Design an enzyme around this catalytic site. Structure first.
Site, PDB file in Angstrom:
ATOM      1  N   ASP A 117     -21.397 -31.426 -26.249  1.00  0.00           N
ATOM      2  CA  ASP A 117     -20.970 -32.462 -25.311  1.00  0.00           C
ATOM      3  C   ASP A 117     -22.122 -33.041 -24.502  1.00  0.00           C
ATOM      4  O   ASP A 117     -22.933 -32.281 -23.968  1.00  0.00           O
ATOM      5  CB  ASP A 117     -19.950 -31.854 -24.353  1.00  0.00           C
ATOM      6  N   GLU A 171     -30.957 -17.569 -35.008  1.00  0.00           N
ATOM      7  CA  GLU A 171     -30.639 -16.141 -35.119  1.00  0.00           C
ATOM      8  C   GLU A 171     -29.343 -15.886 -35.880  1.00  0.00           C
ATOM      9  O   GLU A 171     -28.970 -14.742 -36.135  1.00  0.00           O
ATOM     10  CB  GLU A 171     -30.542 -15.491 -33.744  1.00  0.00           C
TER      11      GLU A 171
HETATM   12  C1  LIG Z   1     -17.317 -34.345 -20.456  1.00  0.00           C
HETATM   13  C2  LIG Z   1     -16.874 -35.342 -21.528  1.00  0.00           C
HETATM   14  C3  LIG Z   1     -18.083 -36.190 -21.822  1.00  0.00           C
HETATM   15  C4  LIG Z   1     -18.304 -36.686 -23.236  1.00  0.00           C
HETATM   16  C5  LIG Z   1     -19.040 -38.024 -23.227  1.00  0.00           C
HETATM   17  C6  LIG Z   1     -18.672 -39.198 -22.333  1.00  0.00           C
HETATM   18  C7  LIG Z   1     -19.980 -39.971 -22.222  1.00  0.00           C
HETATM   19  C8  LIG Z   1     -19.864 -41.482 -22.151  1.00  0.00           C
HETATM   20  C9  LIG Z   1     -20.831 -42.216 -23.063  1.00  0.00           C
HETATM   21  O1  LIG Z   1     -20.553 -42.332 -24.285  1.00  0.00           O
HETATM   22  O2  LIG Z   1     -21.905 -42.730 -22.623  1.00  0.00           O
HETATM   23  C10 LIG Z   1     -17.539 -40.057 -22.903  1.00  0.00           C
HETATM   24  O3  LIG Z   1     -16.884 -40.911 -22.211  1.00  0.00           O
HETATM   25  O4  LIG Z   1     -17.215 -39.913 -24.108  1.00  0.00           O
HETATM   26  C11 LIG Z   1     -17.021 -36.801 -24.045  1.00  0.00           C
HETATM   27  O5  LIG Z   1     -16.061 -37.518 -23.605  1.00  0.00           O
HETATM   28  O6  LIG Z   1     -16.902 -36.194 -25.150  1.00  0.00           O
HETATM   29  C12 LIG Z   1     -15.849 -36.340 -21.018  1.00  0.00           C
HETATM   30  O7  LIG Z   1     -16.259 -37.485 -20.695  1.00  0.00           O
HETATM   31  O8  LIG Z   1     -14.601 -36.120 -20.945  1.00  0.00           O
END
Ligand SMILES: C[C@H](C[C@H](C[C@@H](CCC(=O)O)C(=O)O)C(=O)O)C(=O)O
Ligand SMILES: [Mg+2]
Length: 535
Positions: free
Chosen positions: A199, A259
């Site tokens: 993530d 590992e």
């Molecule tokens: C913690 C998690 C973050 C990432 C990434 C995020 C980052 C945004 C981006 O793509 O710049 C998103 O909106 O997808 C995720 O969603 O998988 C979240 O936003 O719920």
């Protein structure tokens, strides 16, 4: 086969919305275990599980309060071991999310950290004094709305959060916090997981000088990782993420992975120049194994656009390795996002043919194999906090997170009670049961494509070379050893025709696609693909 990940096809499961086996309206691990036979029947090489760890669920799993346990809502650690073992028995790799860039504010580390400025974990998160007028230390914005800084009276300081206020960012400048996150990953490696989706992988380090980001100059393109209505898109993201120090850490992370021979990592890239960052992060053989970007998770989807993406990527580091995705839990479902103005039954088929024929690994999202359109979630049913800050210009992510349609019966057979998000009416006739024995349904097209792909070495990890096939068709060859294949795709709803740029030894029939080869002229009816063996 310790290189299965390099070209492998992964099925992304969003645990909340896959199958409820207990009756509370929320998908659980045991439901997944129950459906692993279906998953294996897709001809995918494995799965990636979105977070199922202990969490307040404020960002539905991505705010983790205990890294080494399963949230009661999803089941138990034993349930997970059972899932893992059954999955292995079916020849499936199992990867899980790891969310180490930030914790829940309910995580013991943060509870401790926030108490004062001197406790042992005071510097495990990112704290800074207010400016003299009491305001945030800089101009960084949360992706989920407002300043990236939140004031805490206990320390009389702001803490950083790129996401929710309840997702404080970990300070990777603190080696002990870094090592603690590696230890947390090691925990799941020791249970035998085959890898991790990482993530926000480029968010790990922030600039310790806390410099302001520059603005995006008027007219320039905005980042692909956020809707244009989000003020987050008004700055270039230079200091709040993607810092050089992360490279050293990625090496450490990779050392951990080494590992456990045969394990892999796919990083999520969210950056102003995501292809470049992905090449940067997956190069050297000493960092990430693969990563995906939002280049194929946005609005452009023409054959020419795909050409631009391929060319751009081909100019980057030759040792990089991409993972491609056209859908996930963060975006509008591809059949709608890309194919809204296209035939709802035929378009997803050829789109998936392209996806499965690109050079790279692939992530395939639950329901994408069914050609599921984006669901409409009514305001009063909205759950995603990201759907309550920019409404109605942006309505969050619930539309792609509605429960999986197993049958055409009540709640699509997903749950005996009303599920946490409403079952989409349009999904019922597209359910797994309705689609299972229909050789003309998108499900079986996918099964056929993945069997086909699996039978051709060039379609695993072969080189890719673009070929001239006209403006409205997408064409390239894939080559490995004895085998060179010519792959041509018609993503349009009109017949298209081209002169073949290479010489065809034979036609390769797959998944009821229909194409006419007359001498040196190839004709593709609407939404058809064509694969040929090259001499
Ligand atoms: C913690 C998690 C973050 C990432 C990434 C995020 C980052 C945004 C981006 O793509 O710049 C998103 O909106 O997808 C995720 O969603 O998988 C979240 O936003 O719920
Ligand atoms: Mg349940």
């Amino acid at each position: 086969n310790m290189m299965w990940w390099r070209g492998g096809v992964i099925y992304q499961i969003y645990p909340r919305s896959f199958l409820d086996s207990r009756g509370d309206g929320v998908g659980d691990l045991n439901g997944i275990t129950e459906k692993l036979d279906y998953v294996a029947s897709l001809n995918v090489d494995g799965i990636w599980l979105s977070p199922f760890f202990t969490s307040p669920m404020l960002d539905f799993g991505y705010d983790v309060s205990d890294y080494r346990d399963v949230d009661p809502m999803f089941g138990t650690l034993e349930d997970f071991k059972a899932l893992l073992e059954k999955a292995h028995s079916l020849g499936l790799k199992v990867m899980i999310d790891q969310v180490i860039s930030h914790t829940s504010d309910q995580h013991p580390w943060f509870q401790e950290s926030r108490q004062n400025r001197t406790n042992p974990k005071a510097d495990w998160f990112v704290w800074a004094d207010p400016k003299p007028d009491g305001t945030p230390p800089n101009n960084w914005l949360s992706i989920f709305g407002g300043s990236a800084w939140t004031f805490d009276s206990r320390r009389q300081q702001y803490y950083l959060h790129n996401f929710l206020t309840s997702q404080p960012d970990v300070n990777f400048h603190h080696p002990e916090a870094r090592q603690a996150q590696l230890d947390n990953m090691r925990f799941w490696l020791d249970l035998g997981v085959d890898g991790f989706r990482l993530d926000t992988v480029n968010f790990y380090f922030h600039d310790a000088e806390l410099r302001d980001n520059p603005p995006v100059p008027k007219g320039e393109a905005k980042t692909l990782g956020a809707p244009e209505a989000n003020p987050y898109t008004w700055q270039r993201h230079v200091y709040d993420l993607s810092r050089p120090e992360n490279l050293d850490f990625l090496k450490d992370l990779r050392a951990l992975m080494d590992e456990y021979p045969g394990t892999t990592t796919v990083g999520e890239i969210g950056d102003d120049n995501p292809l470049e960052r992905m090449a940067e992060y997956t190069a050297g053989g000493d960092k990430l194994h693969m990563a995906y970007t939002f280049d194929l998770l946005n609005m452009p989807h023409s054959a020419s656009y795909l050409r631009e993406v391929i060319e751009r990527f081909q100019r980057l580091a030759g040792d990089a390795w991409p993972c491609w995705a056209t859908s996930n839990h963060d975006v509008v479902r591809s059949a709608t996002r890309w194919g809204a103005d296209e035939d709802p039954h035929a378009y997803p088929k050829v789109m998936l043919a392209v996806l499965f024929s690109l050079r790279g690994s692939v992530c395939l999202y639950q329901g994408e194999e069914l050609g599921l359109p984006e669901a409409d979630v009514p305001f009063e049913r909205i759950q995603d906090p990201y759907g309550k800050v920019l409404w109605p210009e942006f309505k969050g992510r619930d539309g792609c997170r509605t429960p999986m349609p197993w049958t055409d019966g009540e709640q699509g057979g997903f749950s005996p009670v009303e599920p946490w998000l409403p079952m989409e009416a349009r999904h019922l006739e597209l359910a797994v049961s309705r689609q299972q024995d229909d050789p003309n349904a998108t499900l079986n097209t996918v099964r056929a494509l993945l069997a086909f792909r699996r039978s051709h070495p060039a379609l695993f990890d072969g080189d890719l070379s673009l070929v001239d096939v006209g403006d409205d068709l997408l064409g390239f060859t894939r080559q490995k050893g004895d085998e060179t294949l010519l792959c041509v795709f018609n993503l349009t709803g009109q017949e298209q025709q081209t002169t073949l740029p290479v010489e065809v030894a034979s036609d390769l029939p797959v998944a009821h696609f229909t194409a006419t080869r007359d001498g040196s002229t190839l004709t593709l009816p609407a939404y058809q693909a064509a694969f040929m063996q090259v001499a």
